[PDB]
Design a protein around this ligand. Structure first.
Ligand SMILES: Nc1ncnc2c1ncn2[C@@H]1O[C@H](COP(=O)(O)OP(=O)(O)OP(O)(O)=S)[C@@H](O)[C@H]1O
Ligand SMILES: Nc1ncnc2c1ncn2[C@@H]1O[C@H](COP(=O)(O)OP(=O)(O)O)[C@@H](O)[C@H]1O
Ligand SMILES: [Mg+2]
Lengths: 440, 433, 433
């Protein structure tokens, strides 16, 4: 504890020797004084450029929070010393950091070298971040990330990626959220695509992905879950759940899984959300989510979508459907979703088509790779197969389930055999299996 | 208040006599000083090994939470004293516990004895966890207990054991919960089998088993009873039966009795739950049930199984390609989702004569061993009277029916004799009726 | 604190004047010193027999808890003063109570009169226990006990007595809760039998009785009353109506006064009462009901007995047990859970002419003795007046009909006569109609 006080006193007195001795002895570089200032901070206010430099080289943090709450950069600007401001900025100081009073390094000092340094640091940071992010996106676009997991559905991936890129590059109106409606048969990756998109946007934030299941909303009064009860009713003080989640992460990705299962008057609450990204809870607080992304998944027109997809498979063949027939898909949606204004607010309608033979083979290969890696990681068993296995597994495909049919087929026909053999201790650790078309 | 302050001062001053006197008087061992540290904490920072020893022996907690938020172990490490750290760890201190600033004892530990001791404690905890897992794996197979407590239903026992073992050994996507559909006549061990399974996995916890009878869930408004009402509606505070119980034990075993009677909108929530393993209560709290086990029971095809009896009376009385059960079930549900998601289908067969006499022998043995008027024990039941008790065939009502049968002409006579003081020392049950 | 310290010092020094002054001033007789010894304790260890006497006369407790945890009896016995030990025991001190170290006063006692006195007190306690056991044994036959205050319903009384004996004698599924369903019209002794049973079984005052009207329990009141509004719910009435009383008497006789009016939610939560009991309280407490007695009642089956009268006319007076198995009850209350778990069903028969006239006679006797100027009571033609009263036979809602008959045809006439000053003494009755 004495080391921190000694370092603070040395920094206040501009004692280079004492500051260096304390730092080399393990003294807290960001030591805090009882008055609320640190060694780097009091060095900054006292125009101790050398002390500030040595403290920064020792690991001083200039962004740590009357001048109460003013950081090291704030005090450097207060002294109107440009050398200290430049050194702190080179050390990672934020030129726009704020104190308890809200003052910033860009306000304390008069126009001059300090302002120039702060502005240049801010501009260079912003430009570097912009260029780096753009280059990263170019190098590894969203489409490749989705293709890592999603198989087929090229049109849907292209549409979603185009919309997302248009949003990220700033070429989007901020007055209206972006809304998607995923349509297609069951078990073809709609909610999977939504999950992948949410992960891409908010990879390191669970709060960034808000999931709803509209099976849990199959009656009119279920709207009270979204915004909570009005004043004087049970649960009022709680407030809306969806409103809470949106307030936590305004730019999150909201997924209304199986929206078709909602009562139609539950969708009415979505009008303001989809138009202006505005929603009011039971307490009257209004949530602004203009930059959020809304995804709705349903299979309302599944049969018609499959029939259309046959168009590609109806070709004389001597892949991409124009799908102007959406004019006759609209009546189905209107019949289910009874309000035209609801559909009008949807930016894009994404159609997922049934898998082709090659896509089915790819799915089977994906499943067998997953199982092989699981076996290697768990029991250290190598697992291998040929075309005959993929084709035999595909032959058991069911249209009504898609990827789920493939999963069940692989599990039943192959995984059961691996489990039975393992339980019989016929699989020594490190051994290799070929599935030599093990059938019938 | 004076006792706590005196204990804190004595611990800070390494005064064994004062600390011992305060502990004997009844001073709080975990007393907290106004500066944020306890007596154990200050004894630790001051390298008061003996004070730490006496405090821990009296019940001091070293895991209680600049050095703000530092625990007793944190303070001992900060003092770089091996003795205090060792004593606190022996008292249950966690070497990886984080203070309010996110610094663990390992972080504060300088390389040397303290670091090695903290790593040794961490290794001890990890090895204890690994040994617990190894014992859990190596313990008796579930099928053993099933056979111990279940009579007959060998096919069901084998299927359930195989499924559970496969799940345990991997070989099963953990992203989706196991879903079982139990078919067959009622009162033949379905619920007993589920309880035993719940016993295998949660022998030490009753909460591991949950029941719902879908005779409660036959109309649209009963969906709100399943997962809670919306906020501002009747019963919102209750939050629904299913979620209220699952939130206590996500990896429990859930038994849905007579899913046939479930209203379609309830069938929709169950299928959603099975597919995802994810459910929201009415209060907005979400529950993850990926590793849970869901068991559905019904008698939709009980008659077909009983009459066909493709194993009972035909192959084994303890694949048959019972291909009619699939269309029978399809006729009763949304076959696309309902039957697609089911992981396994388990058949229960009616009891046989051998199973019935085994059950009667087990009931008579339960009555005989529990004879608290001990000296009348060895009231031995010969053989043929147990066969006559089986001859009161009540399989329609299930095993408990046979239990009642036995109790009637096996317990009433014992109670009458005892009340009459007629039969000290016990007797053979011999022949009656 | 000053009064407590002064009283403790006076007791230590055997200062009778100071002790009396402090006691008269309101000083805590059981004042406890910071070292763990009270005024009575220090008076006892110092052989201050007079101080102990005056403290006990003032309400000192000699059972108040290394001598840590030692009672005043322990200290008096340690001092080896016969008078002090005798005085403390006279106040209720237990000669076998253990201190925090597990040492009883007998262990501290030295050979002499102290041994004899402590053993005499222990023998007194043992004799009290044996006397209670003998009284409970003499309570049998419980059928006579009930008949002392009940008329008719011999079959139900005998059934209840036999069940009680079986459970006591180990001839019952004691692991499972004990539950009766009582069936018949209203006002035919159901509540009267439940109350008499509670009065007899429980020592006195029916402290262990718990009766509730399930008609007030609905979806808006189920948890708020049955479980009792738990914390965080609308209302804080934890326990509410049932489990607030079960906290004291786990083996309560608990009456539910109409399951026909009980809500499905409360009938489901009542499923906890069976299996193991352990019904959840609003405070979270659960009571093992394996020993409890539950008495559900209903009038929905009231016709099953009254419409026949064979269960009454053909029960060895001059029909069969479960003539029809749960005729209406299974369809109404979901026998699978609610009634399947009920151990026994008790029928209640319509009152006979002899029973009705006996009720009339007892009520008339009560009114006669209830008279303040009993000299005017002659009860001439009391039997004939009862014959007239029974004309309004109880066939509507129970014995309350006969009570109203008596009130109308007797009490009003007597009140009118008294108002007319026609009741000087030695007054006969009057035969109306
Ligand atoms: N196109 C796909 N490519 C690779 N995996 C897929 C694909 N589609 C689905 N899957 C996988 O198969 C499962 C199906 O999940 P979903 O994506 O959610 O199905 P779904 O289309 O969204 O439709 P529902 O809700 O049954 S209507 C997931 O396990 C996916 O991981
Ligand atoms: N070995 C056994 N086999 C079958 N049932 C048993 C066995 N032991 C006890 N039982 C009884 O079987 C019942 C188990 O639940 P059960 O009634 O058979 O399922 P369900 O009612 O849904 O058809 C219990 O009442 C239990 O007492
Ligand atoms: Mg989906």
């Amino acid at each position: 504890s004495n080391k921190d006080a000694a370092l603070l006193e040395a920094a206040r007195a501009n004692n280079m020797q004492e500051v260096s001795r304390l730092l080399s002895e393990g003294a807290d570089v960001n030591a805090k004084h009882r008055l609320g200032w640190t060694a780097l901070m009091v060095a900054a206010i006292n125009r101790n450029n050398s002390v500030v430099q040595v403290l920064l080289a020792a690991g001083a943090d200039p962004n740590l929070g009357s001048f109460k709450g003013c950081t090291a950069l704030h005090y450097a600007v207060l002294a109107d010393d440009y050398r200290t401001v430049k050194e702190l900025l080179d050390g990672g100081a934020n030129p726009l950091q704020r104190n308890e009073m809200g003052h910033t390094p860009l306000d304390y000092a008069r126009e001059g070298e300090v302002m120039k340094l702060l502005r240049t640091s801010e501009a260079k940071y912003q430009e570097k971040q912009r260029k780096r992010e753009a280059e990263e996106r170019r190098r590894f676009p969203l489409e490749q990330r989705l293709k890592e997991h999603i198989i087929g559905q090229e049109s849907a991936i292209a549409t979603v990626g185009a919309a997302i890129r248009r949003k990220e590059n700033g070429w989007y109106d901020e007055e209206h959220p972006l809304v998607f409606l995923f349509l297609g048969s069951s078990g073809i990756g709609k909610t999977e695509l939504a999950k992948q998109t949410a992960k891409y946007m908010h990879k390191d934030a669970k709060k960034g992905f808000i999931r709803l299941d509209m099976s849990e909303f199959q009656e009119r009064h279920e709207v009270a879950k979204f915004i909570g009860s009005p004043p004087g009713y049970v649960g009022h003080e709680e407030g809306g759940q969806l409103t809470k989640k949106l307030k936590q992460c305004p730019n999150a990705v909201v997924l209304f899984d199986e929206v078709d299962k909602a009562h139609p008057d539950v969708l009415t609450i979505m009008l303001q959300l989809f138009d202006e990204g505005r929603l009011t809870d039971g307490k009257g607080k209004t949530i602004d989510c203009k930059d959020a992304i809304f995804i709705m998944t349903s299979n309302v027109a599944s049969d018609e979508i499959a029939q259309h997809a046959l168009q590609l498979r109806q070709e004389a063949l001597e892949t991409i459907s124009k799908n102007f027939k959406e004019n006759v898909i609209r009546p189905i949606l209107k019949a289910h979703f009874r309000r035209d204004e609801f559909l009008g607010r949807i930016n894009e309608i994404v159609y997922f088509l049934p898998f082709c033979h090659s896509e089915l083979i790819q799915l089977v290969n994906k499943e067998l790779n997953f199982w092989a890696k699981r076996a290697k990681q768990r029991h250290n068993i190598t697992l291998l197969w040929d075309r005959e296995v993929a084709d035999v597994l595909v032959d058991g495909y069911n249209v009504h389930y898609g990827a789920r049919s493939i999963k069940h087929e692989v599990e039943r026909r192959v995984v059961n055999q691996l489990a039975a053999a393992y339980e019989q201790d016929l699989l020594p650790g490190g051994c290799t299996l070929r599935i030599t078309v093990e059938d019938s």
